[PDB]
Design a protein around this ligand. Structure first.
Ligand SMILES: O=C(O)C1=C[C@@H](OP(=O)(O)O)[C@@H](O)[C@H](O)C1
Ligand SMILES: O=C(O)C[NH2+]CP(=O)(O)O
Length: 427
C-alpha cells in the first residue's frame, strides 16, 4: 500500500492553471469521433477517465493524435456512428462519463460490443439507461448482474418515445441526448420524475450545440430530438479547466489563505461546479470573478446547511472544509454520492470521524460537527480520487495527515499533490 504524508501547511497563496474538465473532455471526444471533419481539442484533460475514452476510440478505429503532454488532440471524425463486431471488449475503468455515454452511442445501427470496467464499475447502476435504450429499440444484454455493467450491445436504437429515470444519474439522460440526433427516427425523451445533477445536462446541450446540434428542451421534463442529423467539427475547441478540480484550491484559501486564483474557468463557464465558489462566499470567504479566473481570499468560515444536489462532486470539498468552520455543517440531497466511485456518504463519514469530527451519516445527507482540534489519521481513499483530494485539506491545520493510495487522484487529476504544494507556503 502506497501512501503519502502531508506536513502542516501554514498558509496557501498563489495561482493554479487548472487541468482540463473531465466532463467536457469526454463529451468533446465522443462528439468529435462521431462528427464529420477534423476537430482539434486543446486543454484536454490527461487522466484515467479520459485515457479510457481515448483507448475506446482507438479500439473502435477512430484516428487521432496527441501532443507530448496529452492535452492537445487532433481527431479525424468518423462521419457517423462508430462500429465494431465480434463482441469487442472495451475496458472503461471506473469512468461513468465513458460507460454511460458509450453505452448509448454504440446502440446506433448494428454492433456487437461489450462494455466493462473495474470491479466497482460492475457495482454502479446503469439499468435506467438500458431501460430507455431498449424502449428506443436497442438490444442490450447484462452479462453479469442485472442493472449493471458489463453490457453486451447489439444495436438497434432507432428512436421513438423513450422514458428515462433521472433520479439517480443525469448521465443516463446525457447519453440519450448525444445519441438520439443520429438515430433514423425522431425521439421524444420523457423524464419520469425528478432529475438530479441538472447542471450536467446543460453541459451536454452546450457541447452538442458546439458540434452542430440543437434540440427542444421542454422545461427539462421532455426533450424533443429530430433524427437523421450529423455532428460537425467545430474546428479548434478549448476545453474549460475543471471546476471540480478547482474546488480544493479555492477551499484551501477559504481555510488558510491568503488568496488562491485558479485559471482556466471564469464567470462564463458552463460547469455547474463554479457555483462551489458561491458556497465558500456564503461561509465567509471572499470571491473574485474574472473572464478566465476565479479566486478566493480568506475571510472567515461559518458552517452552512444546504441542498447540494446541483454540485454533488465539489460538495465533498465542503465536507472536509467543514472541519475548519464554526458550527455544524449539513449537506443535503446528495443520495447519489452512494453510487459513485465508492459509497461516498459512508466513506466521508468514516474518514471524517477518524480526524475527530462527530458525524451523522444520513441516508442522503451528512451532518458534520468539527472537533476543537484535529488529530492525525491515516486516511483510506476507497479508490476515489476525491477522497484523497478532500482529505488533503486536513493538513491546513496543526496536524499532518497520511493519505493512502495517493495515486488514486489520477482518475481526474494526476498532478494534484504537486499542485497543492505549489500554493503551500511556510510563511
Ligand atoms: O455527466 C458528467 O460529466 C458528470 C455527471 C455527474 O454524475 P451524476 O449525474 O450521476 O450525479 C458527476 O458526478 C460526474 O463526475 C460527471
Ligand atoms: O468525479 C466525481 O466526483 C464522480 N464521478 C462519477 P463518474 O464520472 O465516474 O460517473
Amino acid at each position: 500500500m502506497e501512501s503519502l504524508t502531508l506536513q502542516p501547511i501554514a498558509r496557501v497563496d498563489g495561482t493554479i492553471n487548472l487541468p482540463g474538465s473531465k466532463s467536457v473532455s469526454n463529451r468533446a471526444l465522443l462528439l468529435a469521433a462521431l462528427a464529420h471533419g477534423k476537430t482539434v481539442l486543446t486543454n484536454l484533460l490527461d487522466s484515467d477517465d479520459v485515457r479510457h475514452m481515448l483507448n475506446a476510440l482507438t479500439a473502435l478505429g477512430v484516428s487521432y493524435t496527441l501532443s507530448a503532454d496529452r492535452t492537445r488532440c487532433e481527431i479525424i471524425g468518423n462521419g457517423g456512428p462508430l462500429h465494431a463486431e465480434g463482441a469487442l471488449e472495451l475496458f472503461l475503468g471506473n469512468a461513468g462519463t465513458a460507460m454511460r455515454s458509450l453505452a448509448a452511442a454504440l446502440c446506433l445501427g448494428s454492433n456487437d460490443i461489450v462494455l466493462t470496467g473495474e470491479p466497482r464499475m460492475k457495482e454502479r447502476p446503469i439499468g435506467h439507461l438500458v431501460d430507455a435504450l431498449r424502449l428506443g429499440g436497442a438490444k442490450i444484454t447484462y452479462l453479469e448482474q442485472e442493472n449493471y455493467p458489463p453490457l453486451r450491445l447489439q444495436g438497434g436504437f432507432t428512436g421513438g418515445n423513450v422514458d428515462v429515470d433521472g433520479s439517480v444519474s443525469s448521465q443516463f439522460l446525457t447519453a440519450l441526448l448525444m445519441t438520439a440526433p443520429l438515430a433514423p427516427e425522431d425521439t421524444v425523451i420523457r423524464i419520469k420524475g425528478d432529475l438530479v445533477s441538472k447542471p450536467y445536462i446543460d453541459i451536454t446541450l452546450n457541447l452538442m450545440k458546439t458540434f452542430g446540434v440543437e434540440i427542444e428542451n421542454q422545461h427539462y421534463q421532455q426533450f424533443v430530438v429530430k433524427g437523421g442529423q450529423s455532428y460537425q467539427s467545430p474546428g479548434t475547441y478549448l476545453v474549460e479547466g475543471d471546476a471540480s478540480s478547482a474546488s480544493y484550491f479555492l477551499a484551501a484559501a477559504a481555510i488558510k489563505g491568503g488568496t488562491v486564483k485558479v485559471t482556466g474557468i471564469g464567470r462564463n463557464s458552463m460547469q455547474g461546479d463554479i457555483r462551489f465558489a458561491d458556497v465558500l462566499e456564503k461561509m465567509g470567504a471572499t470571491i473574485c470573478w474574472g473572464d478566465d479566473y476565479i479566486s478566493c481570499t480568506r475571510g472567515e468560515l461559518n458552517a452552512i446547511d444546504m441542498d447540494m444536489n446541483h454540485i454533488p462532486d465539489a460538495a465533498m470539498t465542503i465536507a472536509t472544509a467543514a472541519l475548519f468552520a464554526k458550527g455544524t455543517t449539513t449537506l443535503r440531497n446528495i443520495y447519489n454520492w452512494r453510487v459513485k466511485e465508492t459509497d461516498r456518504l459512508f466513506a466521508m463519514a468514516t474518514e471524517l470521524r477518524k480526524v475527530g469530527a462527530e458525524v451523522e451519516e444520513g441516508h442522503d445527507y451528512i451532518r458534520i460537527t468539527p472537533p476543537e482540534k484535529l488529530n492525525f489519521a491515516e486516511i483510506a481513499t476507497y479508490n476515489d480520487h476525491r477522497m484523497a483530494m478532500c482529505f488533503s485539506l486536513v493538513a491546513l491545520s496543526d496536524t499532518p495527515v497520511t493519505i493512502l493510495d495517493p495515486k488514486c487522484t489520477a482518475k481526474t487529476f494526476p498532478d494534484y499533490f504537486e499542485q497543492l504544494a505549489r500554493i503551500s507556503q511556510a510563511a
